[PDB]
Amino acid sequence: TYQFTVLFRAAGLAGSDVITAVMSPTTRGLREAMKNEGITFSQPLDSISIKLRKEKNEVKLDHKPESVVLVKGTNTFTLLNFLINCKSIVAAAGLQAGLPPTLLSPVAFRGATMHALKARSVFSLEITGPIMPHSLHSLTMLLQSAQRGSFSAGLYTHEPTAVFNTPIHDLQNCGLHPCTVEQLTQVNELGKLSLRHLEMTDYRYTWK
Amino acid sequence: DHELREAQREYLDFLDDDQDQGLYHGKVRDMIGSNEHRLIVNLNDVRRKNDKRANLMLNDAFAETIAFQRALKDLVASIDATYAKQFEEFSVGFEGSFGSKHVSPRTLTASLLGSLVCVEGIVTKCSLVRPKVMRSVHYCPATKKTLERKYSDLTSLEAFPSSSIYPTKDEENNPLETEYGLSTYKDHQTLSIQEMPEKAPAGQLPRSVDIIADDDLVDKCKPGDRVQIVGIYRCLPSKQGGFTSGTFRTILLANNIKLMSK
Amino acid sequence: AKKSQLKKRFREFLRQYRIGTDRTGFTFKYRDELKRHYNLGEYWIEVEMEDLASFDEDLADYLYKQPTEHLQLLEEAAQEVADEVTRPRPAGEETIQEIQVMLRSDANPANIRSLKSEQMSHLVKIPGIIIAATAVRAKATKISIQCRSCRNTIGNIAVRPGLEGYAMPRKCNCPLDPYFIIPDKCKCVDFQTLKLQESPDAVPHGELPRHMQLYCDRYLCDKVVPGNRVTIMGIYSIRGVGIRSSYIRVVGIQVD
Amino acid sequence: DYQAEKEKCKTFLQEFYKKNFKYGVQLANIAHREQVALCIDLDDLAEEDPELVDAICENTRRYTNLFADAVQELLPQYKEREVVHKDALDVYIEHRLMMEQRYPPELMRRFELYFKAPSSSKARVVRDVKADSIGKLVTVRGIVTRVTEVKPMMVVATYTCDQCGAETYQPIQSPTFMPLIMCPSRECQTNRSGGRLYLQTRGSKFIKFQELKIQEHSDQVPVGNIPRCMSVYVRGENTRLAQPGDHVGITGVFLPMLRLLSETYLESHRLVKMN
Ligand SMILES: [Zn+2]
Ligand SMILES: [Zn+2]
């Protein structure tokens, strides 16, 4: 969306056992709206004036990557319906006024449009566009054989999606390489941090 | 107007702070509960969420004020239709930090005309609170018809000199009777602010500025008070016979009166 | 018309005047000053009168005797030159501001008691001492009118400078005199009135000093406070049977 | 529908429980020229129908006339013992009728109708009478500081023209008026020359008038603020009922003065000398 980003994962990915969903920049009003709809989420990271003071501790990390919200189980279905019927997904004033949120996926779906990443070699090779983890893993797998296990990579990251690495704990037909499935079915080690430099020497990985 | 429509949309989006931290959604509910028709909008929030509107309001107060008032009316009608039906038009007052518009009666030049300013001074005189006419409802006994009419003057926004006040005859010269209980009236008061005596250059007389208060802004301060008025700065054209001297006087419409000493 | 020729001559004076000798170097004096003042935010210049005489004696002689129209043409020429010198202005400042021209000269000053009635509508230079001042009011320059009945609009009307008004039209082009001034569609400038008193030595024996009303506009406001000795350069003009009040439109002040 | 309102007022007037017909007896007295001031109390209306009470409280200008007309209609059916008076107006009317054989309701009217504030209504200070109570019914209290002498005020004018015999009428519903100059009678219009009619003071209608200023109690006034005043117009039997220096509580109508910004005055309806 133009304010927040969500990531739905299947059952088994990232060490989980049920379908999950992660919303990084959540606000107090949006969370309260979620509570009044049956969603059971869990953030892992004047008397009315006194109530505002209590909310001040709650409203400190809003609009910041520390307000990540994790939804699990069958609540993802109600989350989907709520997001479809929400009134703040589409901006009503500004440059992105009326534009619906963008959907990204590694496999085809109803209404999808096949796209391609731009590759250009200068030795160096440059690839631009929305890079998803399976694309990066496949690229590394190819370059390992092509470059005889010797290359270095510089990764530029989209900051508002770095908190998705927060730990949360039969995929043969998902349409992914078995090595990629094995890699993605691990436990998230990084926290609020993303890879910035990857180096491979003599078929050994030393990430920075 | 397309620009006015865009301003109205953006202001209505700003006011409906529901799925965000519920500040100005709670404020509107509080205003409705307390039976008021003026909302004090801090423009620090507007600048934080939409800087272009904040600057445009600081430099062109008239159209932006009209758009903001209409957006507030729409939001109130959304919250409660009957309350919106009670009041013809809602008012908006501003506060916060203005920047280079924080002036005094001495530094209030003629280049600030039409700009939302915030004047600091000490009151010197206040007039009496006399009523003013906005809408009059007439009735014709012969035809059993109820007539209505709207008035305006030059000392209000959307200024227009309106004549033929209190009509007495219909189209066919039928007698007309005015129903005073059905007409709408509002208060009116005139004040004067003076530059602080401690910050006035020696020898020269202190400067002054005349302000206009209306509705709930009347009887908010007395002579001898340190105040801080916020409102639009405008000229009053003067016409004598068929001639205009060209030396118009300046007035300061007010939308928020705040004391300092308290 | 001759007005266009006069304006072109004033523009040429502004663009081509130079000071210095070829032994050291030449520097354009008024174009550089115009650029510097416009960039600084001060929209005014101080044009001497001997320089204009040296460039074109006829042009100087038409300013000492018919100051109104020639000063207006000089101000328009200054605005055009200032617009062309800083042509690529930053975003938001495309519109060109109006320039005010102030005059100065080294002539011997006159006296208040020497102002005859022949020297009406002529540039004069009178010393004195300021004894009074008024609050800075507002004076309109551009006005727009609108009919009360048919709401026809006649905008961009110009009002002459000084204590002079504008007779409003009678026919609507809707009763007689249906036009009212739109409040927000008016451009105004600063406005002040002073009182100049004859110097303490020029006063004859056994007689009280005489006075004279002054008029100040735009950047000339709030420059002199009561009790200052000044030398005033201005236009003698008029504001019993046939008696008319006379004031002095000030176009230059030299505080002593 | 104002006709329905008038019928409801008549229905209330004829039948009043107490079933002592206070209104009926008083109207009979008025028809007998035994009473002039009739004070309708709003609590009885609240006993019957509070909607009419609210409606009359919102606009006490039309319903006063409605009550007056209802009383005027009910008057003829109570004149039992004819009349025992010697009114100059009645003598003038009688002689004019005798010449006629050979009329506005206000002209043929001598009863003044006033309302009483319901017990629910509460007294208000002078400062508390804002612009939102214009045309409503209010109850102010304060100290009278000045009273003027009673003077006659023209209500309806009665002109006569020499050319014709039809007397002209000119109601006066404004503080100022211009006297008629040319006679508009159809007899003069037929002559193509309007007669120079003159007003006959004998046949005109005059009412007692009094003006007084009411101030604010010093204790109620805030220490910093100065006391404020108010002008009250008193007409009819309510005249000569107050003197300067008396604490009073006045129930009346808040109205503007016309002659967009206007002054205000109070049309008194019931004056009580509280303490
Ligand atoms: Zn017209
Ligand atoms: Zn006649």
Residue numbers in the entry:
A (entry chain R): 291 to 335, 395 to 471, 485 to 531, 541 to 579
B (entry chain B): 9 to 270
C (entry chain D): 27 to 199, 208 to 273, 287 to 303
D (entry chain F): 4 to 21, 28 to 111, 125 to 281, 291 to 306
Lines from the paper:
MCM is a ring-shaped ATPase that becomes loaded as a double hexamer onto origin DNA before replication initiation. Activation requires the recruitment of a set of firing factors, including GINS and Cdc45 that bind MCM to assemble the functional form of the helicase, named CMG (Cdc45-MCM-GINS).
Although no DNA was found in the complex, an extensive globular density feature, resolved to 2.7 Å, could be recognized straddling across two CMG assemblies. Within each CMG assembly, this density bridges between Mcm3 and GINS. Automated docking revealed two non-overlapping solutions, with identical cross-correlation scores, showing that the unoccupied density in the dCMG complex corresponds to a 2-fold symmetric homodimer of DONSON. We named this 24-mer complex dCMGDo (for double CMG-DONSON) and subjected the complete atomic structure to real space refinement. We found that DONSON contacts two separate sites on GINS. A second interaction involves the N-terminal A-domain of Mcm3, at a site proximal to that engaged by GINS subunit Psf3 in the CMG. In fact, by measuring the distance between the N-terminal ZnF domains, we conclude that the two MCM rings hover over one another rather than engaging in direct interactions. We detected an ~60° clockwise rotation of one MCM ring pivoting around two aligned N-terminal ZnF domains of Mcm2 and Mcm6 across the double hexamer.
